[PDB]
Design a protein around this ligand. Structure first.
Ligand SMILES: Cc1cn([C@H]2C[C@H](O)[C@@H](COP(=O)(O)OP(=O)(O)O)O2)c(=O)[nH]c1=O
Ligand SMILES: Cc1cn([C@H]2C[C@H](O)[C@@H](COP(=O)(O)OP(=O)(O)O)O2)c(=O)[nH]c1=O
Ligand SMILES: Cc1cn([C@H]2C[C@H](O)[C@@H](COP(=O)(O)OP(=O)(O)O)O2)c(=O)[nH]c1=O
Ligand SMILES: Cc1cn([C@H]2C[C@H](O)[C@@H](COP(=O)(O)OP(=O)(O)O)O2)c(=O)[nH]c1=O
Ligand SMILES: Cc1cn([C@H]2C[C@H](O)[C@@H](COP(=O)(O)OP(=O)(O)O)O2)c(=O)[nH]c1=O
Ligand SMILES: Cc1cn([C@H]2C[C@H](O)[C@@H](COP(=O)(O)OP(=O)(O)O)O2)c(=O)[nH]c1=O
Ligand SMILES: [Mg+2]
Ligand SMILES: [Mg+2]
Ligand SMILES: [Mg+2]
Ligand SMILES: [Mg+2]
Ligand SMILES: [Mg+2]
Ligand SMILES: [Mg+2]
Lengths: 150, 150, 150, 150, 150, 150
């Protein structure tokens, strides 16, 4: 279905480096529709819930500390295969191993400062969207380009 | 002071044409700091208050109808001389008369579909910011590049 | 030989989305030489001949209907390994599976609206070129950059 | 009326420098619709007719010789105020005096190698269009973005 | 003459903000030829000689202190009217008053952090070039594009 | 360690095609720091030493002849995993096989005119850096963005 959604968040390093517009533009050019967007400074509670799956991993501490250190731009994009496509556009966890053309491939060098977060599955996307956005903050009627879909 | 702020809104035509990222990027590259950002579909009340100054002018009706027809991306940028600078970056009311390099100059052709709104003075910026944003939605501690300011 | 040629066509969705220049520019930057170029609205006969190989496949009907629905920009590029290189630059049949950096990877989401057509072999390139272009519409003496070839 | 048209031609220097796509893209982003497009090597007769107004001026000889020396990309764009707008996007006769953001301002240095030709009035546009294009080579039903026009 | 030269220097703020390539690219696209290029951290003696004309002005102290605080990328471009053209591409002393499309217009906000230095006349260009570059560091035989000059 | 360095050289074809800025910009956007930069025309001795490893290979003759035929822009970038990352950004030896998004993938077609040279290992990087640069031409104290490294 062309109504799948994914959650993306430009982390504090991405915001501080002035890459918000660059990132949003890549997704708009692709044809995905922006259905939610806001800038906020995450609380420790939000950070810990969002990254809950990593609680027993060694990088969790710094991960949570870093995401709550400055503004984050949260967004929700809608479109066919958006979760997997958005990941391909981001690259892989390690920016140095991400291919030129992807976001981390073009702009990142350190795994701890990898610019953006993207849901890894439809299940985690649905969970993240509900965590960061209230229902009234999301567009209900989406209208993409019919030049995009058959 | 380097803490002046302006209100900018990518109108429905700008959002539908996929120019949100392009626009935000121009302001980030300039060095202005994003202190507020959200996507919403304006109510008639908000539209009428925002454009109140034009109530007796012939284009008011269509102006209000158009801005409430689809999503709008509202943002607040902070920096030295941001109100006047943001206007120069936008161009002038008529896109056809806007110079190549400005937003309306590069992307617009019709005055009724001129892509973006930018406050025209510090007084109207302060008024617009309070109309569209709640205080908690705005960053209090701004941190630009010291490579930007002396 | 540096005189191999390929046939590329920006489909109606690509034309309507304003991607003609973006596409031509990628090929010019690569170093391929434009030897034929024209905009036309394909007739049913041209569409059916061009896509003949797909006549018994399920998508043929919509394929032919779509390509004849609006203007198409037809072009012929010349250069060493242009057929295979042009395909790599396009991506793969499914835009969602095309890598960031390729045309379909950066701009497409639906297989039925995948923006551009590129010959898949030297044999099909030669056939397509003769179908879409008359001999007098093609440059005979090509002059690329000697900074491009040894 | 939103159906005004202008004639633009990327001269041989523009074609040789690989600026065709860059130029077309600027006009597509602006919102003008491509209604005619073809690459051809101008004959002396076409060159002399096109530039007839300059026959008694000192640069006419070289002008005609240069335009017939290599391929030219001819195009017709349609939109509100396209003739005057297309000129503003081109810059002025002298590239060195053209403002950054315009085509000649960004890419040219010599008046004799100023990249592109654009009609200077609706009257000359109508004359040039008829000289370079046959009626069947021009789109009859144009369909721009309603996000562009009110 | 097409052999005029100008001296340009990307200041420490421009270098720290990662704008070296962006700046060089604008001049290459214009058609000017790079005849000298090097990165160095200016000594106080070089800074004071370069900016000698401003010794009695209030901003001289900070100017000299800032230019010696980090790396600077020095370059010499050659071409017809390069001194005046390079200035137009830079903008004006105050970045906020510089037009969108120019370097300071697109990237700067503070006069003390205005990114780049460009000679203001042929006389000062010749003086600056001799101050920053040794003769053997400059190309003697320049070869631009004949697609650039008549 | 975040202080690894690699040697990159924009070859004469890259310089002549006006791709110096484009190339430097890709590395600056990635987050690598420029620690050395200069334009020079390589002597036969430098060319032969640099490419010594290829002395018994068939392409050595033309390789050495070509690199000494015009200006070359030599640079040294510093950052975590810069040697391997810089190679990924360049593409592979054959430009036609290089992926869209990489330098050779986007701009090259012939192996003999493949635009840029990048060290293939830390050992060869250290050797090349010492061959092309004198110690005083290299920054000793590097200062990247802490938004880049954890
Ligand atoms: C796996 C891993 C992740 N992290 C941090 C940065 C990753 O964005 C974040 C989440 O891990 P992960 O979900 O693997 O990455 P992605 O961001 O691509 O979904 O955890 C590290 O710092 N080091 C590591 O080795
Ligand atoms: C003056 C004018 C404005 N309008 C609409 C589009 C303008 O964005 C909007 C507000 O007018 P104005 O404040 O003049 O323009 P700007 O948007 O540059 O601040 O009113 C018209 O449709 N026609 C006109 O003649
Ligand atoms: C294979 C396939 C193709 N098509 C359409 C879109 C493809 O451009 C067109 C031709 O098929 P194909 O030659 O496989 O693709 P390409 O365009 O990459 O050469 O047919 C579909 O709609 N669905 C499909 O599953
Ligand atoms: C006026 C002028 C024009 N020309 C050439 C280049 C111009 O493109 C061409 C046509 O002149 P003109 O119509 O003035 O310029 P434009 O191209 O902007 O319409 O004549 C010169 O070579 N030198 C000159 O002084
Ligand atoms: C005139 C002026 C210059 N300066 C600094 C920044 C300018 O780059 C530098 C040189 O002055 P100037 O030569 O006027 O500017 P430009 O850099 O455009 O040649 O002096 C100030 O800080 N404040 C001022 O009011
Ligand atoms: C291997 C190879 C290299 N060369 C030339 C161009 C290569 O840049 C240069 C060095 O070879 P190599 O080190 O393989 O390539 P790279 O430049 O990617 O490090 O030798 C050829 O001309 N033909 C070939 O088959
Ligand atoms: Mg994950
Ligand atoms: Mg106003
Ligand atoms: Mg096929
Ligand atoms: Mg004229
Ligand atoms: Mg000065
Ligand atoms: Mg090698």
């Amino acid at each position: 279905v062309n109504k799948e959604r994914t959650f993306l968040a430009v982390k504090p390093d991405g915001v501080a480096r002035g890459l918000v517009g660059e990132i949003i533009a890549r997704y708009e050019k692709k044809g995905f529709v922006l259905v939610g967007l806001k800038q906020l400074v995450p609380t420790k509670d939000l950070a810990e819930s969002h990254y809950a799956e990593h609680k027993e991993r060694p990088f969790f501490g710094g991960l949570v500390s870093f995401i709550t250190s400055g503004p984050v731009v949260a967004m929700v994009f809608e479109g066919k295969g958006v979760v997997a496509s958005a990941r391909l556009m981001i690259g892989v966890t390690n920016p140095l191993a991400s291919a030129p053309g992807s976001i981390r491939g073009d702009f990142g060098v350190d795994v701890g400062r990898n610019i953006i977060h993207g849901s890894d599955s439809v299940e985690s996307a649905n969970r993240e969207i509900a965590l960061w956005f209230k229902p009234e903050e999301l567009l209900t009627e989406v209208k993409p380009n019919p030049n995009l879909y058959e």
